Design a protein around this ligand. Sequence first.
Ligand SMILES: Cc1cc2c(cc1C)N(C[C@H](O)[C@H](O)[C@H](O)COP(=O)(O)OP(=O)(O)OC[C@H]1O[C@@H](n3cnc4c(N)ncnc43)[C@H](O)[C@@H]1O)c1[nH]c(=O)[nH]c(=O)c1N2
Length: 563
Amino acid sequence: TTYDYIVVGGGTSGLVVANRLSENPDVSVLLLEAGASVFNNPDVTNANGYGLAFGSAIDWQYQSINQSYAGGKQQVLRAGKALGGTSTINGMAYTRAEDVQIDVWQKLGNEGWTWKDLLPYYLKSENLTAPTSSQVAAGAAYNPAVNGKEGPLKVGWSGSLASGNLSVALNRTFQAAGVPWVEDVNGGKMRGFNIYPSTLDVDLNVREDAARAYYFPYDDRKNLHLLENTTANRLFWKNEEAIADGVEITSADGKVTRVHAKKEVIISAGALRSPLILELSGVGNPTILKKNNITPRVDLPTVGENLQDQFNNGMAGEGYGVLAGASTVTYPSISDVFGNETDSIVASLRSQLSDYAAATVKVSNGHMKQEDLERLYQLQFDLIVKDKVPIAEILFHPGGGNAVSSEFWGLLPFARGNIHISSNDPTAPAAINPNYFMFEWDGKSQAGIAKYIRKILRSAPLNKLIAKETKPGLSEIPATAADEKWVEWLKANYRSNFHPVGTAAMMPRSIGGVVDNRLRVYGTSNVRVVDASVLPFQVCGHLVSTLYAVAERASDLIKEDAK
Ligand SMILES: Cc1cc2c(cc1C)N(C[C@H](O)[C@H](O)[C@H](O)COP(=O)(O)OP(=O)(O)OC[C@H]1O[C@@H](n3cnc4c(N)ncnc43)[C@H](O)[C@@H]1O)c1[nH]c(=O)[nH]c(=O)c1N2
């Protein structure tokens, strides 16, 4: 029951760390995973199975508090309970981030974290299957210079991919609206329309989750150990800067035991669990810890703060006939969405930034300083307004038969919330509050994006295919309706976009960070967080690509520190 490294959470990020640290045959690694294999789970393996696993035994189905700035309801925040984590239940889209938005990580004080520092690790993680000519005819494309050829994560396009009326029409309609087709959204400039690749083993025609990528091909390594169906409760400490001695675990039979780490404990339980594990271990806000019958070990009160999530809405149209083709993504900038209204939207946002920052201070009861929040919000504002990073993701796909479905989300809302333990019982549900719709921009941008989608459906040449909008439809929201009617409908119908970051944010400790630029938790010698918790801001694209790259990079930092 002693190992060099214990990796808590056999998920998207954790499996990368366990894979890379176990490359040294003299280093022993223990993975702790609450779930089990999903190698044979048909809701997981099906390349066309997104959504099948929702609400099943492999979905944690975490519950938020009532969202008082939105519709007042509790929202589910889905997450994978499985070897492979959330990569087993996700939408399989493989898209990255805007170069300048990774560069901001260094601007905020994280030395060595820029697009060019992370780029080799995106490449290291990936093995892209080049598209066939029929896939190229459907619009599949890539830039060879920005895609890896030999990494564990297989990426590619469906063998079923075929050009069809809907995707040809969407491409032409966006181009006419001034949004160009881009060959690859993964080279650091994401704006455009694209037939995006997926985390797919194209030869096997199965979802390429993190366990199929980083675990099963390597599972006979004698130095790589898995304890599945096993829940990590908390870390325990050597008897000053805190030195983790190991992890306390509960097995399937309910027995509580200890496993010991000789070098480090890496916490990779996801953004909605890693901060809870810290809190249960005494690392966090001492007032919250003492209220919940925990003895504080490290006074780090921003654990669980700076939670940032996006929210997703859906729209739909009906064709005159059957619609087919590629699934598309569009990443429009603020001016693509707002056109002539852009300057007005920008001025309104500019005028509110300081007030947003003031309101966010209260969320943490002042454990983030107003001045630091204003600095962070100014960086996000500049990315939106000056660098013109995409403000939305819009997916369009055939919905079956004559249906076209769109799913979309604002990428850079300003609302921050938090997650905290609700007791010292490791099984108790956390208090999770993303504060969806807290700030005017967050809903106003969402409404702008929805109106833009309505306009695209009615624009040539796509309009020749589309009989009418069906969701919301013109009866529910007439085209003469004010913006507030859009915001009301979006509030009533959104879901979490399941993209939470920031709950153990990488920032300097003086401005409220939880981990340093080597992902080590402040106040500890040998504890790291390596998962979405550490991203200090949202990214424009889909999270796994960046989380794999971050975990690949962390693995090198861990190896260096061991030498
Ligand atoms: C429905 C849906 C749809 C999408 C997405 C998410 C969701 C929920 N995402 C987001 C992406 O899939 C997600 O952000 C990452 O998989 C999260 O990886 P992490 O390593 O942070 O946590 P992740 O959740 O993967 O891993 C945490 C692991 O820790 C385990 N665990 C938790 N608590 C534990 C404890 N106490 N003890 C032991 N084990 C514990 C969990 O069971 C899990 O295996 C996505 N991304 C993308 O790139 N493309 C997409 O198309 C989508 N779409």
